[PDB]
């Protein structure tokens, strides 16, 4: 965990140590991304192979990548991959579609389209309700993370008496609450008397903080921070892409099983398996690259990580 933080710039003395947030959130993000139980078991097999490579303490070298690599970072890697597989299986149980679908075969699985005595919490085809609920959940996650970052910067400014930075932070959160209130009121229901007052107070706080921060800088950066808040929506994008690719591959396997389940089902399943493994590795490399980049940019640009 700490290796990813240590790869970047060193923090200054007396500042906030940003290490523990990544172990909390990054495996959770990855579990939201993939949620594939069988592919998680494949990662568990890889982790078992790496644990065997640990117990044979000989270092790891790759001629193609000029890789030189020692047992201790491998131990850190197998621990973090244990966290990976745990979080992705405990999210894939909610995301029960794994290797595509098995509702066509698992009569125990309970859906309105295919009944069963054990229900499945999240469907795939019913994007009417499920997509809206996960989208509001993800934007709530983005809001709470950006609010935590702004609060951390404000607390640091309070501690070190950089009160200009504290005024900048409180103006940032005032603009946050103002734009969020106005957007929610525009998209939401009427009788926004409390919402309108929230927007008024947020705008007034932002203006007064600008006056204290009189040098006139951040008023276009506010919309950039708003887009930064909005940037968390791609978490659903990656997971939905992976899920729908797995679903269509399982649809191909199902088509092979229905037409020629006497003879062609073996070829269909083996072709499906090899396609599964190759496209899944090829796309999950980027999938695991995604949320670490997300946290890297979003938390660290905001709380004050730029300065040495």
Partner 1 sequence: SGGLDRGLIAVGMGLAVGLAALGTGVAQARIGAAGVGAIAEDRSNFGTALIFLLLPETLVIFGLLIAFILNGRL
Which residues lie across from 67 on neighbouring strands? 62
Region of 12-20, 153-161, 203-211, 243-251 interacting with partner 1 (CB under 8 A): 243-251
Residue 163 touching partner 1 (CB under 8 A): no
Interaction residues for partner 1, span 244-263 (CB under 8 A): 244-245, 248, 251
Query: How far apart are CB 203 and partner 1 at their closest, in Å?
Result: 17
Query: How far apart are CB 225 and partner 1 at their closest, in Å?
Result: 10
Of 185 and 301, CB closest to partner 1:
301
Q: Give the one residue of 143, 240, 257, 265 binding partner 1; rule: CB under 8 A.
A: 240
168, 154 Cβ separation under 8 angstroms: no
Vertex 231 angle, CA 226 and 232, to 5°: 120
118, 103 Cβ separation under 8 angstroms: no
Interface map 56-75 toward partner 1 (x if CB under 8 A): --------xxx---------
Q: Give the one residue of 221, 258, 259, 261 binding partner 1; rule: CB under 8 A.
A: 221
| Backbone angles phi and psi of 193, in degrees to 5 | -60, -40
Closest CA to 89 of 126, 37, 42: 37
d(CA 147, CA 139): 12
Residue 136 touching partner 1 (CB under 8 A): no
Region of 16-24, 70-78, 106-114, 236-244 interacting with partner 1 (CB under 8 A): 236-244
Of 8 and 260, CB closest to partner 1:
8
Query: How far apart are CB 78 and partner 1 at their closest, in Å?
Result: 20
Of 203 and 296, CB closest to partner 1:
296
The contact set with partner 1 (CB under 8 A) reads 8-9, 64-66, 125, 127, 131-132, 135, 187, 220-221, 223-224, 226-228, 230-231, 233-234, 236-238, 240-241, 244-245, 248, 251, 279, 282-283, 285-286, 289-290, 293, 296-297, 300-301, 305-306
């Amino acid at each position: 965990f700490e290796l990813l933080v240590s790869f970047l710039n060193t923090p200054k003395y007396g500042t906030f140590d940003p290490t523990p947030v990544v172990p909390v959130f990054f495996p959770f993000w990855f579990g939201m991304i993939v949620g594939d139980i069988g592919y998680a078991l494949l990662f568990y097999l890889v982790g078992r192979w790496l644990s065997g490579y640990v117990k044979r303490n000989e270092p790891l070298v790759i001629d193609l990548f000029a890789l030189k690599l020692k047992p201790q970072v491998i131990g850190k890697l197998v621990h973090i991959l244990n966290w990976m597989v745990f979080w992705t299986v405990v999210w894939g149980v909610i995301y029960g579609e794994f290797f595509g679908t098995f509702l066509e075969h698992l009569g125990v699985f309970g859906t309105p389209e295919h009944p069963g005595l054990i229900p499945i919490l999240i469907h795939r085809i019913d994007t009417a309700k499920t997509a809206n609920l996960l989208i509001l959940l993800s934007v709530a996650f983005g809001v709470v993370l950006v609010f935590f970052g702004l609060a951390l910067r404000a607390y640091l400014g309070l501690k070190h008496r950089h009160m200009a930075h504290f005024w900048e932070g409180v103006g940032y959160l005032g603009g946050l609450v103002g734009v969020l209130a106005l957007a929610a009121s525009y998209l939401g229901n009427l009788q926004a008397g409390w919402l309108q007052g929230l927007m008024y107070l947020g705008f007034g706080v932002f203006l007064l903080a600008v006056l204290m921060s009189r040098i006139w800088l951040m008023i276009p950066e506010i919309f950039t921070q708003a887009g930064h808040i909005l940037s968390h929506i791609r978490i659903y994008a990656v997971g939905a892409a992976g899920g729908i690719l797995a679903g269509l591959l399982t649809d191909v396997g199902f088509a092979l099983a229905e037409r020629l389940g006497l003879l062609g089902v073996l070829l269909g399943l083996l072709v499906a398996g090899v396609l599964h493994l190759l496209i899944l590795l090829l796309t999950t490399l980027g999938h695991m690259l995604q949320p670490i980049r997300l946290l890297w940019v979003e938390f660290f640009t905001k709380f004050g990580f730029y300065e040495e």
